[PDB]
From a paper:
We use bacteriophage φ6, a member of the Cystoviridae family, as a model system to study the assembly of a complicated multi-shelled virus. The inner T=1 shell, composed of protein P1, forms a dodecahedral polymerase complex (PC) harbouring the three viral dsRNA segments (S, M, and L), the viral polymerase P2, the hexameric packaging protein P4, and the assembly cofactor P7. The expanded PC is covered by a layer of P8, forming the outer T=13 shell. Here we present the structure of φ6 NC to near-atomic resolution using electron cryomicroscopy and single particle analysis.
In φ6, the vertices are occupied by the P4 packaging hexamer. The six-fold symmetry of the P4 hexamer and five-fold symmetry of the icosahedral vertex beneath creates a symmetry mismatch, so that the structure of P4 cannot be resolved using conventional icosahedral reconstruction. To address this we applied the localized reconstruction method to P4 hexamers. Local areas corresponding to P4 hexamers were extracted from the NC images and reconstructed as single particles with six-fold symmetry (‘P4 hexamer reconstruction') or without any symmetry (‘NC vertex reconstruction'). This allowed a low-resolution structure of the P4 hexamer to be determined in situ. However, in earlier low-resolution cryo-EM reconstructions, the P4 hexamers appeared to float on top of the five-fold vertexes of the P1 shell23 and the connections between these symmetry-mismatched components have remained unresolved. Binding of up to five of the six flexible C-terminal tails of P4 provides an elegant solution to the symmetry mismatch. These tails are likely to be disordered in solution and to order only upon binding to P1 during assembly. Our modelling experiments also showed that six P1A–P1B dimers per P4 would create steric clashes. It is thus likely that each P4 grabs five and not more P1A–P1B dimers.
Author numbering:
A (entry chain K), C (entry chain I), F (entry chain A): 2 to 77, 84 to 276
B (entry chain J): 1 to 77, 85 to 276
D (entry chain B): 1 to 77, 84 to 276
E (entry chain L): 1 to 77, 84 to 281
Write the structure that this text describes.
């Protein structure tokens, strides 16, 4: 189950302050799109109200945004991925001038941001996540029917808006949020593939997502599975390390490599 | 050869309508998410049952084609394949929080979803499907004139809308539905080819199709034959295993490899 | 000459029936487009009247659609080849529930559909077509001035609409129709080339064309010579066999390989 | 150097007008089929004959350029992209001739009417072979830098594709031996995905459509075709072009490497 | 860690305003030339000086971010595609300086005004070289993950390209040693067909246009440029970048592998000078 | 300095006759665009008027078009680079029926047109141009701050319109005009790269530019440095020789190869 502590209740006000304090946007190959902070606040309030209906114990099924919110839109005519970058402009989510809030998960003293759980298909990513990492909230997206779907920690989403709502919303409150998988986004990323058989904007998106979590004191682990050649995975993992607060590589059911940006410094394996 | 409607099928009609109304679904490829009109599937089920009532329950595949039973066969209610992912949004069909309904076909105790019948051209996919699999309903799409077209189990479709209508409609009632083949969709998949000489959205589509069947308690076998190199088929089959409930590989008229997600767990050969 | 037998006259009524009974469309990378059946019927009527005015012995020049019909259009604002597959939908011409009508040409007991006469430039396709296959009607499209143009069996077309009119129109009556060539359609196929250096929709088009002939009891031989590498022709011929009722490979002025789907079964060489 | 108008040319004027009016033609590339205004070609022929009459039959290539003789040089009669559905634009190929083509003595004996492609790498001797070995009656110069051939009285300097077809169909139908050096402005602007041989497939369709356009109007034209292709891939492309033209000439190190001509005595390879 | 405003900076304010008004500039990429609103840069300089005055000369990078000081951060003043005819859009390059450019002591001695490009593969030590060896006065942080450099009082966190140019031209003209870590948000969103070296050709034109923009406004800027390029094509890309900037530094294995600086003493390739 | 001789003053009338006599246009991948001859005439008049106010000694800074003309536009709604060639038409600047005016620069007896100074980055193109070629007017465009910018012969431009104005305007008068560089145009050439890793229209543009100078009796040297592989430069240089009146290749600070079309014939090294 997903148990709501007094620590989570005390973070509600702070979470609302963090969201209102900084206006954020996101961009991919098109034009920068603003994130409606209000929706995340509304989600937190809905989760707290339901938590109150129960004994603080929540079922992942009951906290899905499609059930709690009338509208699940976070992004507020249509632009092509091959338009002039000077007509659309360029946006990256700004960094934190202050020291980021540290966490005990996925690693000790890790800064707020995003961790990428990498590896080839069947390398043990989902296994490593649920057995070793053991998240408080397990977001399930674009993955076939598995044993992890029967878990009361599992929250089934359909859109990118829903992913960010649950990640920012619950992550800000102090929950250890995880996403399995981020394949719906990755496999629909349109554009010319750069060095490593993957679009360059993929690395920019990971940085923008990481900083979005750093700003809202979230500690999120995302399963990032790329359609990349068996030997080109090492290059891509090195490139992802420069774009995320955390990075975990899986090979043959075990953890091959690690990288974490902590209060004790950047730790490699 | 005939398609017989048992009392078991009649008793599932109400449940099928209940599953369809309970969850609103959509589908996305490289464009924008498009909603699926559930009502059309319900209307199809009612038309099949009405005809089964007039006949002895012994129905001919020719008489149950949607173009004949329905006035309009549309299930989806103009965007380029190279449009910003943030302007269209991303959609994946949500997972099942509950345990999926098990089936005896194509394998014992297999969960509801999709099975991909893979193999090179002339590897014996169509032969394995009809002789070894023995499906109740055989959907024939984008295939040249063969002996399987003269079968009373054969239902000849033209559109993707029709495929989903027969698959969800009859599959929900408990019928063992099969599609030979899904080639018109695969060969019209526009986009930049990823690792393995195939567009990445192909794997996302298989997962979205699988989850669509998992949600509506369907057990469907689709023969998937995409344009891929003779040696690159092993990589693609491994990737498809991570995107479907079932996977069957054909080589020299026989079954080379198998993967099934059952109540007894994931079984490899 | 092109001689009209009583057997052809007796098929006129059956041809109008077949054409009215099933509404057909065609799709490539755009949106599905309906085929106006009336135009084919109008063409048959104009050919029969001219055959009745002359001695039954017609000249290919006199039966060209541009001469017999006021308008040659078969297809009834503008869509790009890179448009979302979900916005246009997917269409494949439906298969035949009944047994297809057999023919003695290009092979004994062959089912109605299309035969692809394949080979590199100067492999002997056009020689094999005119000397070994001996067609009744020879449609000449996208080819330079050759000896075959002076033949009384030769009918010179300009559009794809005209090709289908003569193929379906005369083919349905029992004539052995051949197209030399289909290069104006192949070389103008816009899209990203799949495995084998050729667009995947090419194989779907051959199946759709074949089934169009299977439905209207036609036996057509099309010379198909797409821009493909000298060594990649074997792979492409292999994929084409899985997309057509007949397949003939030319090399060094002679027949290299054959495949025919007959009443006695699929025959390979 | 001069362009002389014989009685044979004068006697063909009526026949040329008949050939043009008899068959309506179009052209297509990656967009939609575009009709060719036959009237413009007839108007050009009339202007050339009138000037030939004022002179002694002896004409200067400079004086017979379409931009000088016609007020409007347009042959093709809102805007479509090269990546549009083939089914929405339709497909057009210029129809073949049911009758025997009109044979010529140039570039080869008994060669049928149509187009000949003068191929070869850059500096292989295409322009040299064209002017020294071929000896054309009319030399169309297009998209080529300043050379000795521009000072020739046979040289007619054009700017558009419309102008090329006007001079090729107009003068070729009358019986003149017309040549184009070169067709690089069309080839280098051919938009589309490059097929096998590092060149767009529609290139081969265009050569056939151009050939048949000349076959129908009994024109004997030699076009120097030099597309951007790899040094070793030229052999493959030349073989493919042979299947798309009435004539084909390959140049290598200033000399003629290979030949192909479709004649009344049959197809002749070297 | 702090950003100190000297009398030298105060004396440059007028000079900077004149430089901006004297020459009208634009920028182009694959679309239509877009004009740069000089007024916004002047307004930013005035806001920085006014705040420097309220504080004791010393300023915090957080307080000088354009989003905080200006009501609108737009520098570029309907929508054109990256694949439009070059003749329908025309071509624009920022013009060169007819006079001798203002020399600087940073990033190299006697260097001309313009842009310096700090190259290297990922984890080659670009950010380390920038902060330890180069020591910039103002550190612009853009599209980079949470690092130790973000806690620095020299760090100014931006989000747009408009903001980058405002801080670079605005503070750089006054005499500050401005650095950008990273320029990746721009590089990773460069739409177009990749040329030789697995990178769009307009990338090199943009570096030259950015360099000349700084040469005209007497700025000395160091931009860290991380290219999505294969391990073996980095040498080719660097050679090409050297021909497009006033300064270029290559990083490899935590150290400086190669340098190029256009100084008053001439073009110096791989000099004996610690940064 | 830039000195105006009596020879230049005597050419003013002839330059107007040349510009008025032939209407010209330019095309790239879009539609043909007319060149407004009047603007070039206006520029010549402004240069001569200023040369008069001076002692015949002009500063390159004072003769820049942005300073002398109110509007710098030469080309007189918006078309895509991937539009049908038949809808835009094709334009090449026409050749000269007469013998071209000869020059003593960059080579003895060279015909009027364009010379391409080629070579890898840092091969010594700019060095060869200013030390060995010694041009009368050095147009500086899209190049970084160098010693050549402080030269009184240097004229700094921003647009392609400005380049052609100075090249045609001053070149027609007899000045030895050079451009360092033509990179702003070359690095913004949109389209599919042909053989040699460069767009085919690049070679057509060089010929069109060369013929534009041949028609207006100009002798211009352009630094052409396109993004091409280290080994592919030899192929491209050979192709450029077939597209220009002059061609110079640079390697390791020295001149590797030369080609000039003179009154004494085509001279190779
Ligand atoms: N093709 C295969 N054959 C055998 N076992 C496999 C195969 N693919 C995966 N496995 C098993 O599944 C485990 C990985 O499961 P999982 O965590 O779901 O992988 P991932 O999330 O990376 O796709 C492996 O350690 C192995 O035991
Ligand atoms: N090229 C070939 N040569 C010989 N036999 C072939 C060939 N291609 C297919 N076959 C025969 O057809 C069988 C496969 O039929 P089928 O099930 O229709 O294949 P698929 O559906 O995979 O295309 C093979 O087992 C073999 O007996
Ligand atoms: N490159 C060539 N060299 C020599 N003869 C050739 C060549 N190409 C074709 N031929 C001749 O033409 C014949 C093939 O003719 P044809 O059927 O028209 O070819 P295609 O396969 O292109 O339709 C060959 O048998 C040979 O006699
Ligand atoms: N790179 C070169 N080196 C030496 N001579 C050359 C070179 N390129 C061309 N030539 C000379 O020019 C002749 C070819 O001239 P030309 O007919 O104009 O060629 P093309 O029209 O095929 O481009 C060759 O036979 C040779 O004498
Ligand atoms: N894969 C790695 N394994 C070990 N150390 C690494 C790795 N990647 C980077 N480092 C360390 O980080 C340093 C580079 O840090 P940084 O300046 O942030 O690089 P950059 O800015 O070029 O991405 C290296 O000198 C090395 O000590
Ligand atoms: N990577 C380098 N290493 C050393 N010297 C170099 C390098 N690149 C250029 N140079 C020097 O600069 C000279 C070339 O200068 P320049 O004319 O500006 O070249 P270009 O115009 O072709 O880019 C060379 O002759 C050499 O002395
Ligand atoms: Ca998994
Ligand atoms: Ca099959
Ligand atoms: Ca042939
Ligand atoms: Ca030539
Ligand atoms: Ca860094
Ligand atoms: Ca230079």
């Amino acid at each position: 189950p997903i148990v709501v502590t007094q620590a989570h209740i005390d973070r509600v006000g702070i979470a609302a302050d963090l969201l209102d304090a900084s206006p954020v946007s996101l961009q991919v190959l098109g034009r920068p799109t603003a994130i409606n902070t209000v929706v995340i606040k509304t989600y937190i309030a809905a989760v707290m109200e339901l938590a109150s209906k129960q004994g603080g114990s929540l079922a992942g099924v009951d906290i899905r945004p499609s059930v709690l919110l009338k509208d699940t839109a976070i992004f507020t005519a249509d632009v092509e991925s091959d338009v002039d970058v000077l007509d659309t402009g360029i946006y990256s989510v700004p960094g934190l001038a202050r020291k980021p809030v540290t966490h005990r998960w996925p690693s000790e003293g890790i800064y707020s941001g995003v961790t990428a759980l990498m590896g080839a298909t069947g390398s043990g990513k989902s296994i490593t996540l649920n057995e070793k990492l053991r998240p408080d909230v397990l977001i399930r997206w674009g993955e076939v029917a598995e044993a992890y779907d029967e878990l009361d920690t599992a929250v089934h989403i359909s859109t990118l808006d829903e992913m960010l709502i649950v990640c920012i919303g619950l992550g800000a409150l102090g929950f250890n949020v995880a996403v399995d998988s981020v394949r719906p986004l990755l496999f629909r990323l349109k554009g010319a593939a750069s060095a490593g058989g993957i679009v360059a904007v993929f690395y920019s998106l990971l940085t923008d997502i990481s900083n979005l979590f750093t700003q809202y004191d979230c500690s999120v682990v995302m399963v990032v599975n790329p359609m990349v050649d068996a030997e080109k995975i090492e290059y891509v993992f090195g490139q992802v390390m420069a774009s995320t607060v955390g990075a975990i590589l899986c090979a043959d059911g075990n953890v091959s490599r690690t990288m974490f940006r902590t209060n004790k410094g950047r730790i490699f394996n």
